[PDB]
């Protein structure tokens, strides 16, 4: 209830799209990888950016 409040107050009338709430306030991320070629382009190493 702090990140959600922080992004709600920035809205000009209190309404925000639902598709950007997990994108900016979620704490955990889950990735499903088909094969190794896709793996080495998305989550290579120990830290990645998304």
């Amino acid at each position: 209830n702090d990140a959600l409040n922080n992004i709600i107050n920035n809205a000009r009338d209190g309404c925000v799209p639902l598709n950007i709430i997990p994108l900016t306030t979620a704490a955990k991320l889950m990735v499903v990888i088909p094969d190794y070629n896709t793996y080495k382009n998305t989550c290579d190493g120990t830290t990645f950016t998304y």
């Binding site: 920035n10 950007i20 994108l23 900016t24």
Partner: protein, 311 residues
């Protein structure tokens, strides 16, 4: 003797005019093309047979043919004066092809010709007809159009199911290469409508009077009115062209910074959801003379027909 080699250098203008006849002498050329007709006894959108035209392809420095044609036609004397007057009124628009009126004798009599310069081989109606009446048994026009504009190469069609949408979904990427041409044609159409309104000319716009570069011609069915009170009729044009606007994705350039295909994308904030003004700006930019009220939000519509129209 003379004639063919004198008509050639009379059609040959004053700019560079490296011309070559399209297998003719002084006679006309016959082709099979698509038109949009309404003349009180016939109507429809079909493929008729053109009869009165002589075409000269243009060359360049290394003597290899290019996509530029000089189309000269002969007709009566009254249409000559009418078209000359309308063109003189409309000649300053940058979206109007360059006409050239001269007189030449084929016999003891003298007949008038009208010559248009630097057109393409196919018009917009040909593309619309090819895409809206698809038949894989004979699609030569579509293949020619695709290969003459660097959408693909001639060996792309050696594949089978190259046209299918479920198999080979790469045909979408192949088709999406004409969107910029379509968008430039739309902009030139808006320019032409503005010029017609300012000059005081009344006429109906069809797809077969515009080539694939956007230029306009054929002012044979127009009339004259007081300046500032012109009115173009653009119902059939937009209505028939509409299904092609999404197949080729003509509005892709509107997601870039300066409507330029070489700059990065626009970065909207994630909290914006209205976009009610961008829709109006797009409508005013591409559909200015479509005369029917447009509601960005379908909650203000009057009935189900208006809902369909705005959706």
């Amino acid at each position: 003797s003379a004639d063919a080699q004198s008509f050639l250098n009379r059609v040959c203008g004053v700019s560079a005019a490296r011309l070559t006849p399209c297998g003719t002498g002084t006679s006309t050329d016959v082709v099979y093309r698509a038109f949009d007709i309404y003349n009180d006894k016939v109507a429809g959108f079909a493929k008729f047979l053109k009869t009165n035209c002589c075409r000269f392809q243009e060359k360049d420095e290394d003597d290899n043919l290019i996509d530029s044609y000089f189309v000269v036609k002969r007709h009566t004397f009254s249409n000559y004066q009418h078209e000359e007057t309308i063109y003189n009124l409309l000649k300053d628009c940058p979206a109007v092809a360059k006409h050239d009126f001269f007189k030449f004798r084929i016999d003891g009599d003298m007949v008038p010709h009208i010559s248009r310069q630097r057109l393409t081989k196919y018009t917009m109606a040909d593309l619309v007809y090819a895409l809206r009446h698809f038949d894989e048994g004979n699609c030569d026009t579509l293949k020619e159009i695709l290969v003459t504009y660097n959408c693909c190469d001639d060996d792309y069609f050696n594949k089978k199911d190259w046209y299918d949408f479920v198999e080979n979904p790469d045909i979408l990427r192949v088709y999406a290469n004409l969107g910029e041409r379509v968008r430039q044609a739309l902009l030139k159409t808006v320019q032409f409508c503005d010029a017609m309104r300012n000059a005081g000319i009344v006429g109906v716009l069809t797809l077969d009077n515009q080539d694939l570069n956007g230029n306009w011609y054929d002012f044979g069915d127009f009339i004259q009115t007081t300046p500032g009170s012109g009115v173009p009729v653009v119902d059939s044009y937009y209505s028939l062209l509409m299904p092609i606007l999404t197949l080729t994705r003509a509005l892709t350039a509107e997601s870039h910074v300066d409507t330029d295909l070489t700059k990065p994308y626009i970065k909207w904030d994630l909290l914006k959801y209205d976009f009610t003004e961008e829709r109006l700006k797009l409508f005013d930019r591409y559909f200015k003379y479509w005369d029917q009220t447009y509601h960005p939000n379908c909650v203000n519509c009057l009935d189900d027909r208006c809902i369909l129209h705005c959706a």
